[PDB]
Design a protein around this ligand. Structure first.
Ligand SMILES: NC(=O)c1ccc[n+]([C@@H]2O[C@H](COP(=O)([O-])OP(=O)(O)OC[C@H]3O[C@@H](n4cnc5c(N)ncnc54)[C@H](OP(=O)(O)O)[C@@H]3O)[C@@H](O)[C@H]2O)c1
Ligand SMILES: O=C(O)COc1cc(F)ccc1C(=S)NCc1ccc(Br)cc1F
Ligand SMILES: [Br-]
Length: 311
């Protein structure tokens, strides 16, 4: 099954295309190719600074009638400097404008922390620490709920929220819409069994980001572990006559997760979609789970002292 049912009643494609780091001069073609080869879910964010170019691609494929808008599942995210009551709607609207859409299928709080509003995405003090906002997560959630009620988004969710933070939202006094999704880092070196079982037990769908270990993350280092080169994963791939990436994409799908591998390489975009015609065994799945090292590629020192930093 290609889509998972969310607690808002809508169906979400379990495979999407990621767009963080996709250069603005490559990402329009990447998304055009993705839609042509079958993708129906695109993962976006204002902070990635490429939503206009993503939107050019989406718009051309809608115009050309390659796909219907109701067949697409477009996700974006509220950046940390817009957590304030009076800034959430305009942030969402900017994203809609850039993506050329009149609604999003899903809008996430990108990180639990709010930052001082302004032009800078990471406002710092003179000593290098991010400057917080005093807006708490529950007030930002209420602002997200209004976007549903105004028809700008069909579902709302969270991203990078830890157990305590998800629970805080679920226990919100007067909660109107539960989060549909929690999007978190997840791959064989960071398997997230505790947080995933918690979210799944509450009917929250988990999306796995960086499923290939984000080898293009700006802060990579030569010595770091490499999923795509791990000979044990290669061996599982070889047994199935698939690539390592295909194994790494199929793995979260069989955990009832959504997965959002990024590529701007047309051959790889196509290859990465070819994951609905094989099955990893239970043994394969447990073996991949056994590679957990609690190795997190998405973390940031400048934000570690923020009250709401999740890790
Ligand atoms: N919510 C959050 O806080 C958050 C944080 C991080 C990521 N995300 C979302 O998750 C998406 C995926 O994560 P990610 O971008 O960090 O990394 P990723 O998907 O784990 O890895 C992307 C890297 O893998 C390469 N790649 C893709 N397919 C490949 C294949 N078949 N063979 C070999 N290499 C392949 C890509 O290269 P090329 O592009 O050069 O082909 C790129 O360098 C992001 O783009 C973003 O949409 C969300
Ligand atoms: O964030 C992404 O989607 C992928 O990553 C990024 C993508 C961007 F376009 C800009 C910064 C980031 C980083 S540095 N994210 C880490 C990060 C940000 C905020 C807080 Br609170 C903690 C934290 F760990
Ligand atoms: Br944070």
């Amino acid at each position: 099954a290609s889509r998972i049912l969310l607690n808002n009643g809508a169906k979400m494609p379990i495979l999407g295309l990621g767009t963080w780091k996709s250069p603005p001069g490559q990402v329009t073609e990447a998304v055009k190719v993705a839609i042509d080869v079958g993708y129906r879910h695109i993962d976006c964010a204002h902070v990635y600074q490429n939503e206009n170019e993503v939107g050019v691609a989406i718009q051309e494929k809608l115009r050309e009638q390659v796909v219907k808008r109701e067949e697409l599942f477009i996700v974006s995210k509220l950046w940390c400097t817009y957590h304030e009551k009076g800034l959430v709607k305009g942030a969402c609207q900017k994203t809609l404008s850039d993506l050329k859409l009149d609604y999003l299928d899903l809008y996430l709080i990108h990180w639990p922390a709010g930052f001082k509003p302004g032009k800078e995405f990471f406002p710092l003090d003179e000593s290098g620490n991010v400057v917080p906002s005093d807006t708490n997560i529950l007030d930002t959630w209420a602002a997200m709920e209004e976007l549903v009620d105004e028809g700008l988004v069909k579902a709302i969710g969270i991203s990078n929220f830890n157990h305590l933070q998800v629970e805080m939202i679920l226990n919100k006094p007067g909660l109107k819409y539960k989060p549909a999704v929690n999007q978190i880092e997840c791959h064989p070196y960071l398997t997230q069994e505790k947080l995933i079982q918690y979210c799944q037990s509450k009917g929250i769908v988990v999306t796995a980001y960086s499923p290939l270990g984000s080898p293009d993350r700006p802060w990579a280092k030569p010595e770091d572990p490499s999923l795509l080169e791990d000979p044990r994963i290669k061996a599982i791939a070889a047994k199935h006559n698939k690539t390592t990436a295909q194994v790494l994409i199929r793995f979260p799908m069989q955990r009832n997760l959504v997965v959002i591998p990024k590529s701007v390489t047309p051959e790889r975009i196509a290859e990465n979609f070819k994951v609905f015609d094989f099955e990893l065994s239970s043994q394969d799945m447990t073996t991949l789970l056994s590679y957990n090292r609690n190795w997190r590629v998405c973390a940031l020192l400048s934000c570690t002292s923020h009250k709401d930093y999740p890790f």
